[PDB]
Structures are given as C-alpha cells and as structure tokens.
RNA sequence: UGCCUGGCGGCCGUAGCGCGGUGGUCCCACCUGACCCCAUGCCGAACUCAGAAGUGAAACGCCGUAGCGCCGAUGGUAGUGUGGGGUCUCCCCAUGCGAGAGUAGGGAACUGCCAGGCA
RNA sequence: CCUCCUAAAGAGUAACGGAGGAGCACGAAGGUUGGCUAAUCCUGGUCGGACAUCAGGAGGUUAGUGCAAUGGCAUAAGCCA
RNA sequence: GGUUCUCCCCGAAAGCUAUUUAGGUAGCGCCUCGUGAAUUCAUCUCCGGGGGUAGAGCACUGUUUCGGCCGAUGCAAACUGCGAAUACCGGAGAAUGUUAUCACGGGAGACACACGGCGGGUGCUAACGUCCGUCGUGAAGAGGGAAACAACCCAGACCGCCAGCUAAGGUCCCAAAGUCAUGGUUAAGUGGGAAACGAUGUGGGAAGGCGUCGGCCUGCGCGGAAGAU
C-alpha cells in the first residue's frame, strides 16, 4: 500500500524501555532521522505508541 | 416430587458415563409401556430404540408392560445391536432398581451374548 | 411548531464531545423506531434560551436539519452537577 | 496481640499443555473439570491428554468448566 | 409432510415468577391389596407386582396476559496507558481504550434425534 | 506452620503491620451400593406460644462440612441403612 | 594506604531467596569472552483467556441518619447482583532490529547507593518527616539553560573545520539575538516573599429593582507575609 515518512523529533534518553523498543522497531536511530514505512494498522499503532516524538507525513 | 427426584438421581451416572465417552443403553420403564434406547457418546442421536407400544413385538404379548414384555424388549434390542455392531455398550439403570423388570431386561439383553 | 436549527455530526468520540463543549456546542442523539439513530449537534445558547419556557416539557420538538422535518420528544437530558449548562439530550421520534 | 502461597491459573486458554499438567491449583473448586480433565484429592484440575485448554460456561448454575480439546 | 404426547442432548431467566383458559384420540399422572421379588432408621414413606374399574383431582404439555423479572443498543458519563502544563493536596490539554445504571427494542423462547396417536 | 487486607483486577512486593488458631483429632470422622438431603418463617397442637416434641404449608442451600478463621460445596465435598 | 607504558571493543551492581544472624557464609539477577541452537527474543496489529482494581451498586459482610427492630436514604482495608484502562499467559501476522533469545563453559565485578517524577501506606490526612511498586539522572555522561547549584529541563562527546539548522532557554546593556506587532491587566517596583480573614481599587461577565437604586462571579494590588557583617 501507500508508504509514509516517519521522522524522529525528540530524543529518547529519558523515555521508557517500551518507547525505546518502539523506536527500534520503527527503525529510527537519531533525532531528525527519517524512514519510509508502508502504512498498515500495526504500523499505525506503533506510531501512536510514540506519537509524542515522531512526525508522520500522512 | 417423583420425576424430578428420579432425573436428579440418574444424572449422577448420566454425567459419570460421559467422561469416558462410551455408548450407553438407557431404559425408561412405565407401567403402560417400556422403552430402551442406545445413545452415542455425543448424546443427541440414538443408534437403536425399542418400545413396547409398537406392534412389531406386542402381537405375542398380552400386555405392553410386564416381565415378559421387558424380556422381549431386551432380546429385540440385543439382536438389533448384534446386527448393527454396537461393540459392547455400557448400561444405565436410569435411577431405577435392579431387581424387577430392569433386571429381567438386563438379563434378556445379556442372554444374546453381550459383554456389558 | 417551534423552529430549531442544528448541525449534522461528523465525528464521534470523547474528543469530539470535548471539542463541542469547548466551542459553545454540545452533541445530542435522536432514536426511536426501526431506523438507525441520528447524532446531531446543537448550539448551547439557543437550547438554554428555549429551556426557560414551561411549555418545553409539554411540547413536541421539531428539528429542521438540511431541510428535513423531525418530530421528536424529550426522552432524557443530562445536567451538570453544579454548572447550569446542558451537555447532552436523548430524544425519541414520535 | 507467614509465607504466601501460590494460587491462580497456571495454564490459560490456548495452551497446548501436556498430560498431567496442573491447569489451575486453587483453594477449592473455582472451575470444574470437563472433558479429559481430572480432579485431585486437594481439588486440583490436571490435564489427562495432550491438547489445547478451553474454558466454557455451561449448566443451569452457569459454572465454568475447564476442558481439553485435540491439539 | 402438519397437530398432539414421552425420552435422549445443546442452549441456561429471549428458558424464570404471578394470573385466566385448554389436554384424555394416543401418551403421562392419581391406586386398590400385597400374606407373593423387594421394604420401612415407624409407615407399601420410596421401589416392585395386575389398568381402565373411574378420572384429569395434583403435577406436567400448550395459548394469551409485558404485571414482576432478563437481556439489550447508539449516545453520554466516570475511569484510565502514553507526552506535556497549571494555582501541582488536585485539575486540564492531543491521542488510544472505554464504565455501571437507565432509555429505544425483544421476548410468555429456540434448536438436533428416536418413539407413539390423529391427519 | 495455616486463616483476609494494606499490596496499584497475573504471582510477588513495608515497618513486635493490622488478625487469631494448630501445634490436634478420627485407626473411624476411611473406601464402595441404594435411597434420602434443608436452614429459616406462618399456622395447629395438654405447656408449646416459634423457643422441651410432632404435621399442613412459604422458601431452595441462609443449615452443614470435627476444629479459631477461609473457599467451594443438593449429581452436597452431607445423611440413614 | 599503595599498586608504575599506550591504543581498541563490550561494559555492571549496591537487588531477591536462608542465619544463636545483622560487618560474613550458599543459589538466583546484573557484566564480559568462546561454543552450539529455533522468524529464538523485542515493538506493534488481531484473536482466546483468569481478573475483580478504577468506576458504579448496596443484591452479598457491615455503618450513620430518617417515619414509629419494619422500610427508605447515604457510606467502607478482613463488601460486590455489575465492571474498565493497565499488567500477565498463549496462538497468528507485515515491518525493523549487526541474534537483541536460549543452553554450556572460562573470567569476573558488586552485596551501607543518592536524588527526582508517578500512585499509596505511615505520620497531628502540620513537616524539604518515614517506607513502598514503577520509571528517569548521577553513581559510571561530557555539552546548553535555571547566577553559581550531581539529582531539574534539552541532549548521549571517534577526531578536525574562523560552515548551516535546531531542542530547552532567551532577543534593553553587561551578553548572541524583537527597545517587533496585535488585544488586554497591573500603579504595587506587585514583578523581585508566603496560604487562611478583612476591605468606598480597577476592567469584564450572567442575573435584579418600581428614569430610578443596588446585589453575584473572574482577573490583577494591601497587614498578617518575619533570615541573621
């Protein structure tokens, strides 16, 4: 399906291990890193998990 | 309370036989008529049913309910089971007493050569 | 008889309800019958003004949205514990 | 003017438990054995054959039965 | 293939509680005596022996009664994970999940097999 | 060594924390078959009125199951032979 | 107490179960190297579970009050006819992750942790008082901000550049950047010290009164409000 750009906005230093694992699953390493990911319900839930520091180009 | 007590008392063996999942032979005894049914482990289908009301076996019987009628029902069920292949069903007394017509029917059924 | 102006709901959820309350609005529901229920949006000021009359509890309400006449009756209303404001109403089509 | 004991369900629904596994070690009988499930002297439900574990509500009293189906 | 009756399962208050009516064609029920198979922690109390000799008394099958009870939306409400803010004892903001109760509505249940009477 | 909470609906998770009891007993209170299975309350009894007993009912597990306490328990895990 | 040359990779803990124990003894957990092995493990989506916590409710165990124990109304740690989110177990699935998973072996280190956020117990529901479950920082993290100031906010330093963008925080001078704009509030240097009470101070707002005289609410000021060269 149509793909989307996911970019990391804020750092993940003080975030929870769950949020760190979510960022690892998304594939974001550094602040401002952008990745291309296909849009699926699982990816949408993963984004919503850490929505406070990820920007999505819908 | 007679029917309710009878059903409650029979429910003991009725549930006990279900754990091992074997075909069961149940008998419903009434002064007017007698019935004997073979029920599969599922509990919704009967392999063979015999009744005293039907004229197939009541022609030679003076009355539908008596020791002779019970013996005839037992022998008919036994022969039908032999020709169907029940493979040694278990037995249930339906909460009755194994001293009168129930015992006569059981003896008649076992006479054919059953191993229950 | 009385003319009521309302708006058609588009969003459903607690977020939408909070938006309506904060924007001088409040949602409402009309049901009754074999047809599906309809969610509507009504401004708070007009309903507050109309609630003053004693005939409100004795008159069948007429709703006109998108040029469609709906004849309903007040089945239930929701009132804040201490704030004199209206937040929701369930109505039955008569 | 002590030491806590271990309770609760050990194996939940969908687990392909083995024969003799203790599905639940409870105080009394919170759930009743159904098909292919035993009942120990201490009222412990243990599996009798390999398969999946299911909980089903049946009976006039609406009592939950623990049962094992084919794996 | 339709009505009625019993037995065997699923479902376990949409199967229940209260009220009026209907069932002896078949089936089911009330019962005589038991000195006879059997028995009372006394009682033939319960089971067993011979039915229409009479009946549907009571139980049970069915129709209506929405009176009680049950389930049950949409919506809202309280609550809550995550990030932030405030006057930080407490509350709010964006997002996700979402109460109980009640309202609309339903229902006086349904379904699988065997047996028997009437068609 | 056991009986519920604080202990934030898996288990676990604090301060001579809040709480008592067993440190026994039944060698029958063990196993098996048949049958039975209330408590409680209204009413009749010489007194009995409910309270020293029985039978006509409402009601279906509130009685019980050896224990201090606890869950689950009428196909009673009870209660007669 | 001391323990002497350099570079590279990974990189902890101050916790849980026993003690005639409290400074110590065993196992697990945490670190590293080697070997072997399953889409092994992690995030997320859907599905099957036991919940009995929040919420609600008095039907279950109980409490106060009301009409004269009967009925009703509110309420709860050893209250639930109902019942979340969250957490836990298992099954299926796209994507990412240097296998991050598991087992064995060699080597350890550590065994007075501190502070802060979140929800409780305790405490006189007075304390920057006390203990818990979870997470973060320091310990072992350099850099920027709060004047300095481990516990706060942003952010994890391989090296070099007199290159650009930005997070927190700021743009009158010290000192880099708005003496920028728009609509307001304050007269107290309030800002730049603090809650209860009291008050002819002000803008604004919904409701009164038979041209009329007054009441209610929000915002910002005043004594209490007091730190020692």
From Swiss-Prot, chain A:
This is Large ribosomal subunit protein uL30. It comes from Escherichia coli (strain K12). The gene is rpmD. PANTHER family: LARGE RIBOSOMAL SUBUNIT PROTEIN UL30M (PTHR15892:SF2), MITOCHONDRIAL RIBOSOMAL PROTEIN L30 (PTHR15892). PROSITE patterns: RIBOSOMAL_L30. InterPro entries: Ribo_uL30_ferredoxin-like_sf, Ribosomal_uL30_bac-type, Ribosomal_uL30_CS, Ribosomal_uL30_ferredoxin-like. GO terms for biological process: cytoplasmic translation; ribosomal large subunit assembly. Keywords: Ribonucleoprotein, Ribosomal protein. This protein is located near the guanosine triphosphatase center of the 50S subunit. One of its GO terms (molecular function) is structural constituent of ribosome. Belongs to the universal ribosomal protein uL30 family.
Curated annotation (Swiss-Prot), chain B:
Pfam families: Ribosomal_L18p. Belongs to the universal ribosomal protein uL18 family. GO terms for biological process: cytoplasmic translation. PANTHER family: 39S RIBOSOMAL PROTEIN L18, MITOCHONDRIAL, LARGE RIBOSOMAL SUBUNIT PROTEIN UL18M. This is Large ribosomal subunit protein uL18. SUPFAM superfamilies: Translational machinery components. Residues 1-16 are annotated as: Required for binding of the 5S rRNA/L5/L18 complex to the 23S rRNA. Part of the 50S ribosomal subunit; part of the 5S rRNA/L5/L18/L25 subcomplex. Contacts the 5S and 23S rRNAs. HAMAP family: Ribosomal_uL18_B (MF_01337_B). The basic N-terminus is not necessary for binding to 5S rRNA. It is however required for cooperative binding of L5 and L18 to 5S rRNA as well as for binding of the 5S rRNA/L5/L18 complex to the 23S rRNA. GO terms for cellular component: cytoplasm; cytosol; cytosolic large ribosomal subunit. Signal peptide: none annotated. This is one of the proteins that mediates the attachment of the 5S rRNA subcomplex onto the large ribosomal subunit where it forms part of the central protuberance. Binds stably to 5S rRNA; increases binding abilities of L5 in a cooperative fashion; both proteins together confer 23S rRNA binding. The 5S rRNA and some of its associated proteins might help stabilize positioning of ribosome-bound tRNAs. It comes from Escherichia coli (strain K12).
From Swiss-Prot, chain C:
It comes from Escherichia coli (strain K12). GO terms for molecular function: 5S rRNA binding; structural constituent of ribosome. Belongs to the bacterial ribosomal protein bL25 family. It comes from the Bacteria. The keyword rRNA-binding applies. Keywords: Ribonucleoprotein, Ribosomal protein, RNA-binding, rRNA-binding. GO terms for cellular component: cytoplasm; cytosol; cytosolic large ribosomal subunit. This is Large ribosomal subunit protein bL25. Pfam families: Ribosomal_L25p. InterPro entries: Rbsml_bL25/Gln-tRNA_synth_N, Ribosomal_bL25/Gln-tRNA_synth, Ribosomal_bL25_short, Ribosomal_L25_dom, Ribosomal_uL5_bac-type. Part of the 50S ribosomal subunit; part of the 5S rRNA/L5/L18/L25 subcomplex. Contacts the 5S rRNA. This is one of the proteins that binds to the 5S RNA in the ribosome where it forms part of the central protuberance. Binds to the 5S rRNA independently of L5 and L18. Not required for binding of the 5S rRNA/L5/L18 subcomplex to 23S rRNA. GO terms for biological process: cytoplasmic translation; negative regulation of translation; response to radiation; ribosomal large subunit assembly; translation.
UniProtKB/Swiss-Prot annotation, chain D:
The keyword Cell membrane does not apply. It comes from the Bacteria. One of its GO terms (cellular component) is cytosolic large ribosomal subunit. The keyword Zinc does not apply. GO terms for molecular function: ribosome binding; rRNA binding; structural constituent of ribosome; tRNA binding. GO terms for biological process: assembly of large subunit precursor of preribosome; cytoplasmic translation; cytosolic ribosome assembly; positive regulation of ribosome biogenesis; regulation of cell growth; ribosomal large subunit assembly. Keywords: Ribonucleoprotein, Ribosomal protein, RNA-binding, rRNA-binding, tRNA-binding. Part of the 50S ribosomal subunit. Cross-links to the 23S rRNA. Cross-links to the A and P site tRNAs. Belongs to the bacterial ribosomal protein bL27 family. This is Large ribosomal subunit protein bL27. It comes from Escherichia coli (strain K12).
């Amino acid at each position: 399906a149509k793909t989307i750009k996911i970019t990391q906005t804020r750092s993940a230093i003080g975030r929870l291990p769950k949020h760190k694992a979510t960022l690892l699953g998304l594939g974001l390493r550094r602040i401002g890193h952008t990745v291309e990911r296909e849009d699926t319900p699982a990816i949408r839930g993963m984004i919503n998990a850490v929505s406070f520091m990820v920007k999505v180009e819908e | 309370d007679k029917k309710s007590a009878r059903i409650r008392r029979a429910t003991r063996a009725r549930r006990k036989l279900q754990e091992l999942g074997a075909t069961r032979l149940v008998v419903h005894r009434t002064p007017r008529h007698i019935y004997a049914q073979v029920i599969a482990p599922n509990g919704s289908e009967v392999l063979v049913a015999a009744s005293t009301v039907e004229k197939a076996i009541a022609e030679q019987l003076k009355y539908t309910g008596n020791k002779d009628a019970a013996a005839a029902v037992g022998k008919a069920v036994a022969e039908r089971a032999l020709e169907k292949g029940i493979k040694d069903v278990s037995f249930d007394r339906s909460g009755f007493q194994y001293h009168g017509r129930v015992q006569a029917l059981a003896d008649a059924a076992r006479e054919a050569g059953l191993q229950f | 008889m009385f003319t009521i102006n309302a708006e058609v709901r588009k969003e459903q959820g607690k977020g939408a309800s909070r938006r309506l309350r904060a924007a001088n609005k409040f949602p409402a529901i009309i049901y009754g019958g074999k047809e599906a229920p309809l969610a509507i949006e009504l401004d708070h000021d007009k309903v507050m003004n109309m609630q003053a009359k004693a005939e409100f509890y004795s008159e069948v309400l007429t709703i006109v949205v998108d040029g469609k006449e709906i004849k309903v009756k007040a089945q239930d209303v929701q009132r804040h514990p201490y704030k004199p404001k209206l937040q929701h109403i369930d109505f039955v089509r008569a | 003017t002590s030491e806590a004991k271990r309770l609760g369900v050990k194996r939940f629904g969908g687990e392909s438990v083995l024969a003799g596994s203790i599905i639940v070690r409870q105080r009394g009988t919170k759930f009743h054995a159904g098909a292919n499930v035993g009942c120990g002297r201490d009222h412990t439900l243990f599996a009798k054959a390999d398969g999946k574990v299911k909980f089903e509500v049946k009976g006039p009293k609406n009592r939950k039965f623990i049962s094992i189906e084919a794996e």
